[PDB]
Amino acid sequence: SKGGVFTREQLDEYQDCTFFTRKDIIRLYKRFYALNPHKVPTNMQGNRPAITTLTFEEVEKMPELKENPFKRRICEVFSEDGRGNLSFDDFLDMFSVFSEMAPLQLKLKYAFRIYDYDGDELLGHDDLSKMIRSLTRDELSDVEVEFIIERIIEEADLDGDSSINFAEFEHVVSRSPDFIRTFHIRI
Amino acid sequence: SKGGVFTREQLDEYQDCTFFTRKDIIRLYKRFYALNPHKVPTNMQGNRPAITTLTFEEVEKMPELKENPFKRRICEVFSEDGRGNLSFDDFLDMFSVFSEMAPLQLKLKYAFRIYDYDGDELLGHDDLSKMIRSLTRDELSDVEVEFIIERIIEEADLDGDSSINFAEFEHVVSRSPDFIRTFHIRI
Amino acid sequence: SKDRILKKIQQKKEIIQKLRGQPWYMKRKRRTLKVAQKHLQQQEAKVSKARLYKAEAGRRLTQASRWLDNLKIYLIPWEAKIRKIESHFGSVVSSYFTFHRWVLGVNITITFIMCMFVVIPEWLADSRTQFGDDRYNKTKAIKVMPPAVRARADELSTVWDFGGYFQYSLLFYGFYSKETFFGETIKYRVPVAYFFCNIFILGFSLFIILRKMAANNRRGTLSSGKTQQYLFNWKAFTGWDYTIGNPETAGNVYMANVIKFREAINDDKQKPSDKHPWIRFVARVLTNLFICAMYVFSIWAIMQCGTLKGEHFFAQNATAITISLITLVFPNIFDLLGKIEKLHPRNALRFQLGRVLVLYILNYYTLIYSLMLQLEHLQKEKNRASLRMSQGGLCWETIIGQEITKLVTMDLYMTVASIFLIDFLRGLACRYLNLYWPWDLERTFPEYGEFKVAENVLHLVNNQGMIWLGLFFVPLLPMLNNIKLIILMYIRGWAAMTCNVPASQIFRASRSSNFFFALLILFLFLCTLPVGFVIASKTPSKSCGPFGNQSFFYSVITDVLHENLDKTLVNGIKYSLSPGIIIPVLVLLSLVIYFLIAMVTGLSQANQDLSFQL
Amino acid sequence: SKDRILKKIQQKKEIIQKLRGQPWYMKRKRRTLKVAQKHLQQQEAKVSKARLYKAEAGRRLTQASRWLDNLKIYLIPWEAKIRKIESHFGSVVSSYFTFHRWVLGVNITITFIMCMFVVIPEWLADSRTQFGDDRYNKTKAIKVMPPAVRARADELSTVWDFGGYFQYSLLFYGFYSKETFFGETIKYRVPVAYFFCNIFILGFSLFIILRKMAANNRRGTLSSGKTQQYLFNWKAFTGWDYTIGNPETAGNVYMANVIKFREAINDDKQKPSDKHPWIRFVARVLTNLFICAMYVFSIWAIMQCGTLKGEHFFAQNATAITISLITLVFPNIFDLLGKIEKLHPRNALRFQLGRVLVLYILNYYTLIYSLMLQLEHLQKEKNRASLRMSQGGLCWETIIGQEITKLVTMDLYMTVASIFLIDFLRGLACRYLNLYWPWDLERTFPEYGEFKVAENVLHLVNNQGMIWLGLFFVPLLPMLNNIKLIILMYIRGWAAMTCNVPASQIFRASRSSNFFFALLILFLFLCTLPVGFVIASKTPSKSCGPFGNQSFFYSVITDVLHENLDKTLVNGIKYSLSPGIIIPVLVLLSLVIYFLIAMVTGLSQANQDLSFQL
Amino acid sequence: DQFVAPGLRLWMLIALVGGVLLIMIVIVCCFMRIRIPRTKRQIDLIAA
Amino acid sequence: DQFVAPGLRLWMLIALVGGVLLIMIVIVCCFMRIRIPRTKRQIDLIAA
Ligand SMILES: CC(C)CCC[C@@H](C)[C@H]1CC[C@H]2[C@@H]3CC=C4C[C@@H](O)CC[C@]4(C)[C@H]3CC[C@]12C
Ligand SMILES: *[C@@H]1O[C@H](CO)[C@@H](O)[C@H](O)[C@H]1NC(C)=O
Ligand SMILES: [Ca+2]
Ligand SMILES: [Ca+2]
Ligand SMILES: [Ca+2]
Ligand SMILES: [Ca+2]
């Protein structure tokens, strides 16, 4: 199409480095600009895609992330810089990982990174507690949460480390018949 | 069925504890007596089956074992009391594990016990070395033997302990299509 | 040393290929791509000529493939519509619409095949025809309407029967001439194309469904999950649907997760109980007996309405109306009975799926039986009917095609009416009449409508199976079906957005994602069986259709082979097409599948024992 | 409260059975058995008297099963012979003899079925027949010799063709009357038994081979991962055969292990493969062309010896002699040409096995074609060979049976002669004349002789396939085959012990225990096609029973069904047995088998994984 | 048979008016985006 | 052509004598326990 916002080089690089076509990239740019037209420029030739940033709040207000309890975790995981704002490149990476055509291994790795609250590459007791209490809006009692955590941990505790590394998590969740269906964000 | 040398209770007990029928037990007794009639009694009723013993040399002279490189290892493995003797109960155990109808797990366990020369529950470096020496009549050079040992360890040792535990041995050898055929002694 | 350059080039190329799916930041991926492209440039220590031209061809081909994909991505419709539906409801609901779009694509492929190989050549023959032409002289019987039909063509009764202009059109089997060839040296015989196109379309539909199912199972999915020990992990790490956009659906997901976790920790392994022994089972038996009574009643009613005449606004359409009403009504009664059977919700949904599937199969075969009985009665009655016997005799193929088209159109109309009634009008009644009603119409029966994904999928597969059965007699059946599909799509989406409430829980009957395609395969087989029997047993109408005078339906290709090949080859073909060669294969297949079933039962028992041992 | 007691009792019962395979000394097994038995008998407050008697009956049934197993263990022949052969040569060689004994058992089962259901009733009817009896009145034509045949039966020419007392005996198809039955009501019709027994024997053979294959897979060898990751371990932990008793075979095993280990060290491109520039490829191409030439020569020779006439000692047996000579000679030529090809030893063995299999199949089908042509010629001849018309008409089924039994007997005779010459006389020559020959016979060419296990297995399977093919026309063919099998066994054993020498190195083309049974099912499938085609197409003779003067071979069953279920339902079956329905069933089986294979695949992998986790 | 032909057939006229009515209503529905069912908040807030 | 002996046929007599010879040689070979091939230790000595 027209493609005046990005050079052919930029679109080709994005296509070779992501799962999006030209149309998908243009639509994602339109959504990113509509999130905040003032900060996002009309044209993003050159280094601009990695420079322009939106605060985490400005990105979570979109409908695809508003109702997700892990919106903050997604934004923090995909943010290259930890100052609290997400750029357009990170936007594209986030919505390419959640796209339909992403492989199972990439989705598993990023889901493990999302659920890893403390960021120590292990799904510990507290990470599972926070995830469970977020999934049920804290309705479950403390004893029930502890029981669920213990049952989850004793599954895939091959190392006996009282925590789930990425190997055990991958081995377990790769056999889930519905992980690839839930872990999806269509845009 | 003559049923003279043994009692019905003894034969029933053996059939419960062994894969052999009455005919097989009688034939094995005939072979055991023919190995040395001067010390094996003509009648075996009561405790005598467990007390009449032949020296390891007298047992190895039978054709079924004299050509086997591991005949000494088989005799030592199946000797309940050791001390360079082998009773008739140990004889039946030995020729039952090697029978056609023995399960794969039992034969694997006893093969692991046979190849474990030092008797430390894991096939170490020296056990594999002497096993290769016996298998190739020491024709292979030292460097070749070391290379073969290293390859075997690298294939099987998934624990990084420089030795093959029975779990690793079971997992490796159960996939071999020749263990059932080779590990067999028809008698 | 020479192969080292090749190794480095291949490694850089595979790094470029695999870079698309790396868990790296965008800057890292761009830098690695730039470095790999620089090394692809450093490859200049490479042999020219054949290798250089091979590399150039590969680069050009991958650029062309990327351009083709970019052009293709613009042609996928309803992406926004499916996205909105998925955001409002979820992945399970949007799965039906994705399946609907896929079925529409398959139907479009079938329509393209039929048009290019059958319909368009016949249209070209008709257009090139002139008055007084020999081809016109010979096709006037089945192409030019007699004056009586011309006068009666515009009557509403004939339009309801798809007669008149519809009968004398490329829509039906009869209109196609048996004397149409488009080759001066090597003929492109239209009847041969017709037969082989129908057969190839059946085979190609089977191939497409199998290929899609394989691509959805393996080569793009997990293709795993044969165990059960990961219940808590699977319900915790897949407990949220990331496709949810509506807050109320999110709250429903929260409540469903709460219920599932409580059941797992307190009910699944702690407390089995019973309340009224020898009472609930009696109700179950009575309900099953009544459902069998409903089945036999449906069969009897289909037969009776097949026997009903009267040439009125309803007598001609009685069978289609009855079948459509049964299809749209009986599942609701089955759901109510499952409610009164107090069964487990997952088992209840499985029972509902099985019952609706059995109902569809029984209605299908009863319709076939009634059609054959009506054809036999009409043929014997030979020695309205005046319009039926217009094309030189009783063209029973055209009559069957007209009945199938009646079924399809009435199914569309009744589906539209049902959606307008039990979703829109029901929604309005529950919203505005709630304060006047003696009981709550929104928390008690009948609550706001819920999108029944499984029943809609079953209805869609039933429609596609009817298309498959009627395709031989109705060449343009998929094309009309295309319109139907499109309309259905929009209407369904509209209902979902305007009348339906997200379900409190989704106890999906099938864990696998290929269940819809499995049902499609089952219906494809159940529909290819009767048409195959008709081809192999039924004799075509004497003076109607692409076959006409010929003894059997397959006799045209047999004549072609006999005339264009030596006698011995055809004799060998006939010898190899004998029942004595196929039966031993069938017996061997049955015995080997019995042995495989025993082996897989043993393997499953071993797996269960290993899981229990832990 | 009794649940704990019954659970612990069941656990102890399970321990009773599991004790047989524990890695424990005999004292531990005795103590555990005594303790478990004391616990079992000691349990106070047992189950009710009805289930107490049920447990008593179960114990009695277990005792009876053990007693019958002990009785049966006495009926396994050649245990000593197979043990001696295995001790002298090894497990690979003794595998052929175990397979031979199993095939003998299968043939014995076939003979028992044929005798009990077909041969014995006919013999009883013949015995109860009297001179002047109505059955004698109507069976004198096909059961009583004319004086000419009675006089000429003593001649050796008639004995060669089985046309003497053999033709007028229970050995061949034509002797069985079509009027033989038992019972005033619900008759036991002998022709129906004949047909159903042939069909059931084919199906039962297929089922038995499948059951044996399933048992072999169940044994544990199926647990292979289809990977080479453990080549060193599989060459080290299975590097010795414990069945060896001969020191020379032990030394051969030592040398073979040395060679294998050194090769594995030097394989995987450590020693890159290199040969002559272009000579060996051209040699391989020329050898393949010459082998194809030998194939077409074998086909033409079978055809030419088929069209040979006269009453000479050789013209009658020309076809069987030619086929046997080809079968016993061409594999040797293939082995010799394998030296010219210079392939990988395992690959060379696989190629030779494939070539011999192709030769067997080609000879089988060429014999079918030649017998068909000869039958057509004899049928045209009418409007010593003429004496065959004494039975009444041609009785082409009896002619096929005589030809096939001549082939079987000649195969036996030529196999005995080949064993005597190639193995025994060559052994004596290499032992004694070696002092004089320029070539070292023992060392260079030819060696004393290695027992070709795979070639012997192929020969045995070919013989069994001939038995399957000729079973319809020769009911007693397996019985004679039994004798042949027994003789072969002994001779083969002798050829093993006195003439053959252990192989320097043992290679297996398949390395699977079901490969022989795979060849057996392949041959069964190939042989079941001509007989099925004959039943479905060929019309039976007008004079020789049990299908004399029938429209088809299956017309007896059709008449029986028509007389018993006059219901259209019979037509419905015919309706089913139709080309338009059996093809959808065939494609449905193809679609289901594919899915099934995959499931087991996946299940095995999962099991794989489960075990790994442990 | 109904009174059919005021020039064209009466069923044709009623079909035409029904078709234009359907086109108008589908246009309106496309441009409206209505939502009939109430949210659970609306359901339970008025239960009193 | 073989001719008929008193109450017997010539090929029948040949078959009888061949069969009894075969039975005798089979009986003898069932006890001989012969072994034709030489061992490698019995083969390598031929150099001298
Ligand atoms: C299965 C598919 C891919 C192959 C189908 C075969 C078709 C495409 C081939 C086979 C015979 C061919 C026809 C043979 C004769 C003529 C006559 C003239 O008008 C030229 C085109 C035309 C009409 C050819 C068009 C292409 C043709 C119809
Ligand atoms: C063809 O033409 C007429 C009927 O149209 C009929 O007499 C003749 O038997 C028919 N033959 C064939 C080939 O069907
Ligand atoms: Ca952590
Ligand atoms: Ca861990
Ligand atoms: Ca050790
Ligand atoms: Ca280890």
Residue numbers in the entry:
A (entry chain E), B (entry chain B): 15 to 201
C (entry chain D), D (entry chain A): 89 to 471, 583 to 813
E (entry chain F), F (entry chain C): 15 to 62
Manuscript text:
Transmembrane channel-like (TMC) proteins are ion channels whose function has been linked to a variety of mechanosensitive processes, including hearing and balance in vertebrates and touch sensation in worms. The C. elegans genome encodes two tmc genes, tmc-1 and tmc-2, both of which encode proteins that are likely subunits of mechanosensitive ion channel complexes.
Particles that corresponded to a cis-dimeric complex were selected for subsequent refinement and 3D reconstruction, yielding a density map at 3.2 Å resolution, sufficient for model building. The cytosolic domain includes six helices oriented nearly parallel to the membrane plane, all of which form extensive interactions with CALM-1. Unlike TMC-1, TMC-2 is not C2 symmetric owing to the orientation of the TM10 helices, which are offset by 10-16 Å relative to the TMC-1 TM10 helices. A phospholipid occupies the cleft between TMC-2 H3 and TM1 (“cleft” lipid), and another resides in the cavity between the TMIE transmembrane helix and TMC-2 TM6 and TM8 (“bridge” lipid). An additional density feature that is consistent with a cholesterol molecule resides proximal to the extracellular side of TM2 in both structures.
